[PDB]
Write a protein that binds this DNA or RNA. Structure first.
Ligand SMILES: [Mg+2]
Ligand SMILES: [Mg+2]
Ligand SMILES: [Mg+2]
Ligand SMILES: [Mg+2]
Ligand SMILES: [Mg+2]
Ligand SMILES: [Mg+2]
Ligand SMILES: [Mg+2]
Ligand SMILES: [Mg+2]
Ligand SMILES: [Mg+2]
Ligand SMILES: [Mg+2]
Ligand SMILES: [Mg+2]
Ligand SMILES: [Mg+2]
Ligand SMILES: [Mg+2]
Ligand SMILES: [Mg+2]
Ligand SMILES: [Mg+2]
Ligand SMILES: [Mg+2]
Ligand SMILES: [Mg+2]
Ligand SMILES: [Mg+2]
Ligand SMILES: [Mg+2]
Ligand SMILES: [Mg+2]
Ligand SMILES: [Mg+2]
Ligand SMILES: [Mg+2]
Ligand SMILES: [Mg+2]
Ligand SMILES: [Mg+2]
Ligand SMILES: [Mg+2]
Ligand SMILES: [Mg+2]
Ligand SMILES: [Mg+2]
Ligand SMILES: [Mg+2]
Ligand SMILES: [Mg+2]
Ligand SMILES: [Mg+2]
Ligand SMILES: [Mg+2]
Ligand SMILES: [Mg+2]
Ligand SMILES: [Mg+2]
Ligand SMILES: [Mg+2]
Lengths: 152, 206, 262
RNA sequence: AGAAGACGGUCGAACUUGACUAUCUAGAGGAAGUAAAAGUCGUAACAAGGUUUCCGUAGGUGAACCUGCGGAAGGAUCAUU
RNA sequence: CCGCCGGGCAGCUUCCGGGAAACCAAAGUCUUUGGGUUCCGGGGGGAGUAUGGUUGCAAAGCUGAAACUUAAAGGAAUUGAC
RNA sequence: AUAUUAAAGUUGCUGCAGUUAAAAAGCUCGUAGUUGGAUCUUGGGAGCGGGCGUCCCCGCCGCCUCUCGGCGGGGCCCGAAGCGUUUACUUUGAAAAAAUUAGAGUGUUCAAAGCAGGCCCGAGCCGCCUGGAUACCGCAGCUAGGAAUAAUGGAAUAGGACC
RNA sequence: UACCUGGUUGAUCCUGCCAGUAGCAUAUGCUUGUCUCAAAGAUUAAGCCAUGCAUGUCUAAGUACGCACGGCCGGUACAGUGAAACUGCGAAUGGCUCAUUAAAUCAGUUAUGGUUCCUUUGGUCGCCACUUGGAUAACUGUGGUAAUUCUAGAGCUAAUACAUGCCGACGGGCGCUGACCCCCUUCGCGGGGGGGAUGCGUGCAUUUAUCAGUGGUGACUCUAGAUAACCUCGGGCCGAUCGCACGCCCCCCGUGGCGGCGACGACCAUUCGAACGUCUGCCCUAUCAACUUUCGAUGGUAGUCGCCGUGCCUACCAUGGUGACCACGGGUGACGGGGAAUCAGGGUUCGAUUCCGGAGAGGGAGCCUGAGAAACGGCUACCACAUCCAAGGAAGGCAGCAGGCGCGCA
RNA sequence: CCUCUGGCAUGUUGGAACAAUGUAGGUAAGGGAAGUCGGCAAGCCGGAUCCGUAACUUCGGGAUAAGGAUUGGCUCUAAGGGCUGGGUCGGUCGCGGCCGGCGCCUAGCAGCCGACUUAGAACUGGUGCGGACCAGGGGAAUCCGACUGUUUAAUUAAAACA
């Protein structure tokens, strides 16, 4: 129930939920000893990663996935894929002949960790490049801001 | 032959890619092992850079660990019981990674009888009278009895496991990838996991 | 490209070999070895192009295979062996001994040295290891897996290898106020003390330099390679002293040398 | 240790058969365009071109064309007490 | 009746300045060339034709070529002739 | 002869037209697109330097931090950090295959080329001296300065710091 | 060098074009004394191919009993040349062409903390061993077939080819086990301290599981360490190996130790790379506006395969993914780039073509060997072309270099 | 098409043969409309599932257009529904009630029942499987009448009437 939704058991690897034979009830207070890491580059591993009970292998905090190479920013426009979003990076491409620019938008598919609750669309998001973890997806969400306009 | 490679399928947008070359011997697959239970039949396979891949086709034993207790005798793979991916694989009896086999409890039982100096798997008086007394019978006293009393409320095994031992098999998960390595090494289900898979199997039976 | 390449066109070859156009279609192409192809001076090019010891390849082949040439005190019979930065090339039957240190242009100077000094060489550490049973290692820039080094020699530091023994014999640590020759890019062969190192995580680390004659520049850590504790280096340097004159200053210096001196 | 061989799988050429698509062409008869020309019929238009021309739209007529309705001034009136 | 102000329809007037000009206070602030932005033309003919697509009960409408042809067609203004 | 570039401000970004020469949708609404009024740190202050005072030039008034590291109590200010609200823009640096190009040097007899050449020297020196430069290398990516212009934020059913 | 002339008119000023003008290729015509450089079957037909050649290879150092030569020496195998043949390596480079291929190739940029890597270079390399087994080639000799760089049967005979497999090594060292034994305290059970025969393990690599956190990094499920086992079993591995040149020394006589190379391996680094990924960039076309999707389209979970990461593929779920910021589709007299030609400042056009990258060897496909190939001067099919046949069968690939045919302006 | 309930004695007769002509059924090598006024007659086609579907069009159709594939037996898998149940702790009154306090599955879980379908997979047979029965031949064109309807009881069903 709750976490174990799929047909297989869904555990974090790299922690052994078993060793126990002492008083004061079955298991501890926190019960499951949650593994997480920090991702570096001065990115704060969030509360809901460390505190939260979910699991996801592709989550950069609580999963096997290393951030490296490029770090880009975009803005979230679709949230209908599960544990993933489409973010629309915009940019001004220069033509030289006409000393002018043209708008151009690449909309990248991007893995969104469930440590991030309360992510709306139109949300300025930062994504780290990672190893390719889907056909299209290479980029994990690292931090979210949302503050451009509508409310805290 | 049987190629893994992105070139042959559509782009994110939906449009068809055009094949800018022919198949290559590295953008490559191979036909699957789908190893069964049975007496040991493994084939070697040369792969990239030379090297070897040891494709199991049949497989009788496996090196399963009791996690908590930390013993890990090598054991007969008695039967495949459940497999999360696909049900036809279970029906076939096909070991893959994360297959939930059963394994012959015997060696773990034997280790537990040696180490913790208690019986496991309840019985009237056939195992208890001749062998267990001989395993005990303390001609030394003092040291060994103090050690096995230090092995205190500590023996206290899980209820699910104990039942499984008294029956005489153990639900166990495969961790190796038979068709690449050749072994069927894994771990014994315990605690929350065990509770989950027993619940899955009961639901399957109806 | 069905497998590996076993050629090198002329013109495709590195600039700093000074390889001319009209001669033939190819350059030698180094052997596989302790230096990167585009960072060598193949033995054949060191001999018949720069010394003028030989005239052809065949003559170089003959010079080599009397076992006359001795690259970091060992004897190499490959004419395309990649001798490169801070090696030796001891020639013995004449007793000259060179080194391969970059000129301020960035071309490997013909830099003859004394037979004492020709013992030792100097080397960057690419990485530190810890192998089996807890035994630590180094790996030099020239691919020497030294084992059991000093617990202090960390990455980018430089060691004085003995040669005949092998093994380390005291070292210089990478910090501000240390002599620094650059082994790559635009500032190749310039030499000057460090001054400042800017750690960037992810992307690689820019290291500033200041030349003796007040001229500043920077580079990225990889190209840099230390050679002593401030002003005084741990080796001889070629004349010019890795200082880098401006084209106008060089022209002036050429003009002064002509007419007056003779 | 092990060859030929056979069941099944897999890739899969090739052929047969449709299916769509592009380019190329033959065709009675039809109906245009342009060009030559020392034909024929008239005179539509430019001068009020001898019924101001012109536009939209219908009908008609050997042919240009004509007529109807509503426009136009690029009119043959910047004006009419 | 006599003024002022805003914003309309126009008028006369001039070496504003434009413009091939007739003309235009806009058709001005343009080789001293850049306030913003839409649509749109690229010798004349073929041709607003053929073809497809679409709309329309139809009549037609929108979109819309080519081969081939041709040295001019065209604008304004002047002198004549009519 | 044909392809093609300039001529061609006859495709026009620089830089053409659209009353009559070809040309402004019959008219209005209208989304994408494109384009968008004004506004917030300034004079001044103090010195080095030039033509008692005036007029031109040059380092200073990146703030805060000390919650962090140190080049039984401390200072001193550097590593870290509230990184420059978040970019564009600009300047610097790093990184950039060579050949071509631009372009140093050099009497290939000249030149197009080429990468060499030149000397001391009676040769007795048993040799020597030097070259084989620099520049450019769109855009995007990376680095640190600048903050006019243009965007873009923050405290409005309230929220900034305070043993 | 930031350039204009002729042509509509009776004449004028314009709009406007046509025509001249100068470059650069491709051809062609006429012509041509000397010399230095120098492109050259790309355009059409990635159309067809006669003949010949274009990839082989040996050191002092892996096998020599051809007897083909010869020694100098016999008889202690061997001495020195040495064809052949086995062995090893190479044949994946180079060369050619540009058919395809339009975010593909390719370029700059970065990742491999998501993998492989012959070789080079440096680290590792504690009772047959006074050295084991049998097999085969060249050589010898019977042949078979019309015919091939066809081969069979019989004799032999080697190895670094192919196999098997030991001494070392310290009843010792450290983990567990522990027959037991000793000392102290206690009314005694007990409590504390020590010692200890006999057993099992007595690890580099492999696979799985657990524990603790030497050296590291913006960045660990890293590296190293400890425990439990497992052997990817002969087809996990090194465990433990063949050759050549000098020629020495033993508190000692017949033994035991010794340096200098070669070659060989498992693992780690290195190099050459390769391979996928990241960001940004491409010509025309709307008479291409919707495309993609249970025959993977976009995600998720568990596998499979693969060298590894990923719908790479399978299962089960979800219903996503791209589009006027031009997707999708069509076209290209399209290989990309470096670059070339014009040029005031802008541009316009070209880039088959000597460097880099790609792709391909008549067309499609499949694969063996191998570090590396989906190879084509490797094989297996089919198709399409074609060649001998004694008609049963057999062989083939010039977009290598010459050359031919054909196509054509070339 | 086969069967039970119920009902019959094969339709105004029997027997023996198995000739020709017939009536009614079948099958045919190779060819495939050469037959004939004329494909008349018969034959092909046929059910379902899954694909796939043109001209033309009154935009409704055309359409089962056309053209393909599959189908048995067996053994499994998955997917679809109902019913009932917790007011547990404490008190008190008669397993049941009443009161008060927690609980409050408010992601529901547990036990008990029951039609029938759909999809997928394994194996299997002398490739046989809508096995009998039932059950469209298609296309391209022209003429006429729009259509459905009606019509000459007993030679004309049409283009005639409507
Ligand atoms: Mg420009
Ligand atoms: Mg006449
Ligand atoms: Mg007109
Ligand atoms: Mg105008
Ligand atoms: Mg203008
Ligand atoms: Mg025109
Ligand atoms: Mg032009
Ligand atoms: Mg111009
Ligand atoms: Mg014009
Ligand atoms: Mg007009
Ligand atoms: Mg108008
Ligand atoms: Mg403004
Ligand atoms: Mg005239
Ligand atoms: Mg012209
Ligand atoms: Mg090649
Ligand atoms: Mg590498
Ligand atoms: Mg084409
Ligand atoms: Mg090439
Ligand atoms: Mg190929
Ligand atoms: Mg050919
Ligand atoms: Mg091939
Ligand atoms: Mg060939
Ligand atoms: Mg009857
Ligand atoms: Mg009867
Ligand atoms: Mg009757
Ligand atoms: Mg018949
Ligand atoms: Mg007949
Ligand atoms: Mg007939
Ligand atoms: Mg019929
Ligand atoms: Mg029909
Ligand atoms: Mg008709
Ligand atoms: Mg009718
Ligand atoms: Mg009748
Ligand atoms: Mg009738």
């Amino acid at each position: 129930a709750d976490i174990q939704t799929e047909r297989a058991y869904q555990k974090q690897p790299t922690i052994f939920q078993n060793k126990k034979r002492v008083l004061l009830g079955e298991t501890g207070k926190e019960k499951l000893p949650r593994y997480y890491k920090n991702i570096g580059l001065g990115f704060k591993t969030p509360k809901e990663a460390i505190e939260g009970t979910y699991i996801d292998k592709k989550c950069p905090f609580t999963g096997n996935v290393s951030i490296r190479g490029r770090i880009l920013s975009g803005v979230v426009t679709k949230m209908k894929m599960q544990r993933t979003i489409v973010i629309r990076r915009d940019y001004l491409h220069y033509i030289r002949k006409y000393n002018r620019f043209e708008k151009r938008h690449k909309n990248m598919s991007v893995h969104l960790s469930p440590c991030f609750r309360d992510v709306q669309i139109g949300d300025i998001v930062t994504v780290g490049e990672c190893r390719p973890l889907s056909k299209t997806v290479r980029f994990n969400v690292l931090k979210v801001t949302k503050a451009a306009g509508t409310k805290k | 032959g049987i190629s893994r490679d992105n070139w042959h399928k559509r782009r994110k947008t939906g449009g068809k890619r055009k094949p800018y070359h022919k198949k290559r011997k590295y953008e490559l697959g191979r036909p699957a092992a789908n190893t069964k239970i049975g007496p040991r039949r493994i084939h070697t396979v040369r792969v990239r850079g030379g090297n070897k891949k040891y494709r199991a086709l049949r497989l009788d034993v496996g090196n399963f660990s009791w996690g908590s207790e930390c013993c890990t005798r090598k054991t007969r793979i008695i039967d495949v019981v459940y497999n999360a991916s696909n049900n036809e694989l279970v029906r076939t009896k096909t070991l893959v990674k994360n297959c939930i086999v059963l394994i012959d409890s015997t060696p773990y039982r034997q280790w537990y009888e040696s180490h913790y100096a208690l019986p496991l798997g309840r019985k009237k008086g056939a195992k208890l009278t001749p062998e267990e007394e001989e395993i005990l019978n303390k001609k030394r006293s003092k040291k060994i009895q103090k050690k096995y009393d230090e092995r205190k409320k500590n023996a206290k095994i899980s209820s699910l496991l104990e039942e499984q031992f008294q029956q005489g098999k153990l639900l166990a998960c495969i961790a190796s990838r038979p068709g690449q390595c050749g072994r069927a090494d894994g771990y014994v289900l315990e605690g929350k996991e065990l509770e989950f898979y027993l619940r899955k199997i009961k639901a399957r039976k109806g | 490209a069905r497998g590996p390449k076993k050629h090198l066109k002329r013109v495709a070859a590195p600039k700093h070999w000074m390889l001319d156009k009209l001669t033939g279609v190819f350059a030698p192409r180094p052997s596989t070895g302790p230096h990167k192809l585009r960072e060598c001076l193949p033995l054949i090019i060191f001999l018949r192009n720069k010394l003028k010891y030989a005239l052809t390849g065949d003559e170089v082949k003959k010079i080599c295979m009397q076992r006359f040439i001795k690259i970091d005190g060992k004897v190499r019979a490959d004419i395309t062996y990649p001798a490169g930065f801070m090696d030796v090339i001891s020639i013995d039957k004449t007793g000259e001994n060179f080194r391969l240190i970059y000129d301020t242009k960035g071309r490997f100077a013909v830099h003859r040295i004394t037979p004492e000094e020709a013992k030792y060489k100097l080397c960057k550490v690419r990485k530190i290891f810890v192998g089996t049973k807890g035994i630590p290692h180094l790996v030099t820039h020239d691919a020497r897996t030294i084992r059991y080094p000093d617990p202090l020699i960390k990455m980018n530091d430089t060691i004085q290898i003995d040669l005949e023994t092998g093994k380390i014999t005291d070292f210089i640590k990478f910090d501000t106020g240390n002599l620094c020759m650059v082994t790559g890019g635009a500032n190749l062969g310039r030499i000057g003390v460090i001054t400042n190192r800017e750690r960037h995580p992810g992307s690689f680390d820019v290291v500033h330099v200041k030349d003796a004659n007040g001229n500043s520049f920077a580079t990225r850590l990889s190209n840099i390679f230390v050679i002593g504790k401030g002003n005084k280096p741990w080796i001889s340097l070629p004349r010019g002293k890795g200082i880098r004159l401006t084209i106008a200053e060089e022209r002036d210096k050429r003009l002064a040398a002509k007419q007056s001196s003779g």
